[PDB]
Design a binder for this molecule. Structure first.
Ligand code: HEM
Ligand code: HEM
Ligand SMILES: Cc1cc(N)nc2cc(-c3ccc(CN)cc3)ccc12
Ligand SMILES: Cc1cc(N)nc2cc(-c3ccc(CN)cc3)ccc12
Ligand SMILES: C[C@H](O)[C@H](O)[C@H]1CNc2nc(N)[nH]c(=O)c2N1
Ligand SMILES: C[C@H](O)[C@H](O)[C@H]1CNc2nc(N)[nH]c(=O)c2N1
Ligand SMILES: [Zn+2]
Lengths: 411, 409
């Protein structure tokens, strides 16, 4: 079976055959679409078919399918599974797996860059202190004095689910959030629950609006431990506006390195529960969502006030006007400080080129429209008019439950 | 299988049971989601269960499920179908069916108004001249001197596919589009082929930027006919900006009445191929899409120029800045001229409330996130953070082929 997608701005029609290689499920059925739903101990029984499928893909990509090297590897992995109940990936396989997990990430608009991923092998790690060291080196490498470089650090795979490696932070660098007695929130409302866990684990909180959170790191199923990232490793950018001199007086800043640390990397049935990865920001992530979401810093009001906008009726679009200015400031600040950032126009344009390239050389590109279209100015970016097919390929990044909900405490 | 939807800005959770009523299909499977795809002659057999399903929901809605009246009507339609190979809706059923087709339109953000629909029964129409008359009356009623009122006009149902009633226009009111020898396009580019069909069918084009297109009306399957809508029925709004005086110099205006005329209304298995319906605009439909789409009026660059913005790099967000000002102007203009319009903030907020209402009194609300979220400022509107379930309920509005691709001329 063949499937078609149309760009309605350009009438370009592309043909998807890659969706045939899809195994996992979407959540949708013939009678319902769950396209906008945010989120819709493995045995040797089901593991070798997963391993075989991966190795078949791996050896196809290196043009050695059916070779002796391929057949021996399959033999080797098989024996290791019946004997040890799991198996170990070779370095080459790990690197391939991590890159393709990104390549397959249907919600990621930045995938033109997928083949340029620095992979750090941390599978020899054994303790939280070792985790801290590996993560510090990731941050230094990735940050590169403002010239950001994509990277991922991969900690040991799950075994019996009782000895998981986890990074308890949702991102390596994030600001604290504090609920005040009067109901107000200081800092980042998104991080209030995590901030509280940290504080309980012994963190002494500065209680400011932009405090970098400590790392809470769990090795081999043990209780997590607290570590402070050296401040010299945490690159930050003061937010100012190119025409509005009062904007700096809002006292806003943000960190340069987006590094998500709570997802799970699946490769050939193996599960890597600690695998922090990082790239660079698209401006709207900070300027639209981080700053202007009602449930975050929510600075629309103060910015609209200082612009002296008609905030009485919404049909004055004061909200819309402030939003643009805030996003102008974020991009201006990052560029002025020579910290890698990309605007949503550039990024979406790149994605369309990526996607077309992928349809031609790969037979498709799974893509989640709901997530790919930017949170402002949707239809003046070229992905808005682009039809997309969403399906799940492996290797993949998956969601996993927050560890504090599942962890068995040692004491 | 009793599904939940969460709002991530408020933690409000709603439970959907209405989806289990759904009949038709979405285009998705467990292995693929087609949620962003734009577009994914009935026998005696298929007709009677369809009629039964409809009459069942109708008599439940008036709390007379399992009544003599119910069973009698059921038997009456049953006999008429066996006999005539089709059937006719009672007036009350027709009004119910039309209101619920709107109610079920998962892509429509304006559905909080769904039960205040004025239904004009035009099933006695026989000619294009008659169609023109019914359509002029619709337009005048809907427009109401700027105080817009929702309305639908329903022409005779399909019979054998050879006697279809069709409005060939996509909307009752739309501006012409002409391609220049120079290369570009004057007027509305989306309407370039239709503007040509009209001329190709006999229209005399003034070749302006805002020429109201003629109606092309097809009755009983005959060749369609051109009719000019009386200009005093076409309410238009001159577009000016509340702070930029040079804005008027652009020479922009739009029409007040959005009236879509190329869809198909399905009730109880019956197919109404001509059923123009109208409401009032959400501001972004004109200012974001109509004015700023690249394959439309595409005036973004011209506007930014006049604002002296830095158009050298995309990261100046000059497009975004212009986009907002244009949309401020559209709203300002309509509001100034007392022509009904709604901004995307109030409309999306209205929709969340409608959702709340539907989950409470009905058990759910089919909704297509990809279309409900406005084309600008998405995440600062409350629908962005609202999970939605999309499924197809009947009665419904459906797409149908363009007539010129079908009509045996
Ligand atoms: C290099 C520049 C990159 C840019 C500009 C970028 C941009 C984005 C954006 C804007 C999102 C939506 C997230 C949100 O709105 O909160 C996203 C999602 C995502 N990104 Fe990328 N990204 C980049 C690199 C990477 C890398 C290096 C990886 C992994 C190695 C990655 C993996 C993902 C995944 C898995 C998602 C989906 C998250 C989910 O399913 O919820 N990205 N990206
Ligand atoms: C009264 C004010 C109304 C408002 C503000 C409104 C708003 C909207 C908007 C913004 C769209 C998206 C269309 C686009 O982006 O091109 C839409 C779609 C739609 N509207 Fe409404 N609408 C209104 C009334 C109505 C009425 C009266 C009907 C029918 C009786 C209707 C039926 C539909 C349908 C069927 C679609 C989508 C068709 C599809 O592709 O499935 N609307 N509406
Ligand atoms: C590597 C990378 C770069 C970037 N600019 N944004 C990301 C954003 C995410 C991301 C962030 C948040 C969420 C859920 N709110 C889902 C995915 C993950 C990775 C990213
Ligand atoms: C009645 C009404 C009012 C309004 N403001 N917009 C509409 C927009 C539509 C519409 C327009 C186009 C399409 C297909 N692109 C689907 C639906 C239909 C009816 C509308
Ligand atoms: C390809 C994509 O589905 C297409 O551009 C859709 C997306 N969302 C939309 N949403 C609305 N409201 N109206 C539209 O015309 C579209 N177009
Ligand atoms: C409910 C809805 O799916 C949710 O708000 C999504 C919508 N699209 C998104 N798109 C991106 N890029 N990031 C997000 O966090 C979200 N949130
Ligand atoms: Zn779907």
């Amino acid at each position: 079976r063949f499937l078609k997608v149309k760009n309605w701005e350009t009438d370009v029609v592309l043909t998807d055959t890659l969706h045939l290689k899809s195994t996992l499920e979407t959540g949708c059925t013939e009678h319902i679409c769950m396209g906008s739903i945010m989120l819709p101990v493995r045995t040797k029984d089901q593991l070798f078919p997963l391993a075989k499928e991966f190795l078949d893909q791996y050896y196809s990509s290196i043009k050695r399918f059916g070779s002796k090297a391929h057949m021996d590897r399959l033999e080797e992995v098989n024996k290791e599974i019946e004997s040890t109940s799991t198996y170990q990936l070779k370095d080459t396989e790990l690197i391939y797996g991590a890159k393709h997990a990104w390549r397959n990430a249907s919600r990621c608009v930045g995938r033109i860059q997928w083949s340029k991923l620095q992979v750090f092998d941390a599978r020899d790690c054994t303790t939280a202190h070792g985790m801290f060291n590996y993560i510090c080196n990731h941050v230094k490498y990735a940050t590169n004095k403002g010239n950001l470089r994509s990277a991922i650090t991969i900690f040991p795979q799950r075994t019996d689910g009782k000895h998981d490696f986890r990074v308890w932070n949702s991102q390596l660098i994030r600001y604290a959030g504090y609920k005040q007695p009067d109901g107000s929130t200081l800092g980042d409302p998104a991080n209030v629950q995590f901030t509280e866990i940290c504080i309980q684990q012994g963190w002494k909180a500065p209680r400011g609006r932009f405090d970098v959170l400590p790392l809470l790191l769990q090795a081999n199923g043990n209780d997590p431990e607290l570590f402070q990232i050296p401040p010299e490793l945490v690159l930050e950018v003061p937010i100012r506006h190119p025409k509005f001199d009062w904007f700096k007086d809002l006292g806003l800043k943000w960190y340069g390195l987006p590094a998500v640390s709570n997802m799970l990397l699946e490769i050939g049935g193996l599960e890597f529960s600690a695998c922090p990865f990082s790239g660079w920001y698209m401006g709207t992530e900070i300027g639209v969502r981080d700053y202007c979401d009602n449930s975050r810093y929510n600075i629309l009001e103060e910015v609209a006030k200082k612009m002296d906008l008609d905030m009485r009726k919404t049909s004055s679009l004061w909200k819309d006007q402030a939003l643009v200015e805030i996003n102008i400031a974020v991009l201006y600040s990052f560029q002025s400080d020579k910290v890698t950032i990309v605007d949503h126009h550039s990024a979406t344009e790149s994605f369309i080129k990526h996607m077309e390239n992928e349809y031609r050389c790969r037979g498709g590109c799974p893509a989640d429209w709901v997530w790919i279209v930017p949170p402002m100015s949707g239809s003046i970016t070229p992905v808005f008019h682009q039809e997309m097919l969403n399906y799940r390929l492996t290797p993949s990044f998956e969601y996993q439950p927050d560890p504090w909900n599942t962890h068995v405490w040692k004491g």
